């Protein structure tokens, strides 16, 4: 599971980078990851739609 | 000379071996009596 722990790092770090709080554990890290993974693409898809 | 005529595709990847040939060989044998592949596939044996 080392390949997973090292993503939890990155996830928590990206959340702080983007100013999200996070008093929580690794379980659900993938939930949180998926939420950012799309947020950082849908927020864009939506702005791109607006622009067009 | 040998490397050029024979070993021309023995690197391909790296550190990884020439997977392309590990496959080419497996395509031979499949052709040349496929029963081995029925067994190799059945028990998860692979090219390489």
């Amino acid at each position: 599971s080392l390949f997973n722990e090292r993503k939890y790092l990155l996830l928590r770090k990206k959340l702080d980078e983007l100013h999200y709080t996070q008093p929580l554990q690794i379980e659900s890290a993938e939930l949180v990851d998926k939420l950012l993974n799309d947020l950082l693409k849908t927020s864009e898809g939506f702005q791109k739609l607006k622009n067009k | 000379c040998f490397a050029h005529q024979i070993l021309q595709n023995y690197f391909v990847d790296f550190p990884h071996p020439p997977l392309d040939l590990l496959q080419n060989i497996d395509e031979i044998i499949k052709y040349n009596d496929p029963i081995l592949h029925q067994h190799l596939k059945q028990h998860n044996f692979k090219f390489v």
Binding site: S1, N4, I26, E27, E30 | -
Partner: protein, 46 residues
């Protein structure tokens, strides 16, 4: 949940259920104890 389940089976003595992870790990556990544990804890989560 990072190590999910590939398959499972129950001992006839239903108190123990064994589920096997996708990595081939057999999680052997008291099944009754586990239902009571997670049901009661998850009961107040909302």
């Amino acid at each position: 949940s990072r190590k999910g389940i590939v398959d499972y089976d129950l001992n006839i003595d239903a108190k123990y259920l064994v589920v096997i992870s996708t990595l081939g790990e057999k999680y052997v556990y008291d099944f009754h104890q586990l239902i009571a544990n997670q049901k009661k804890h998850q009961q107040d989560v909302t």
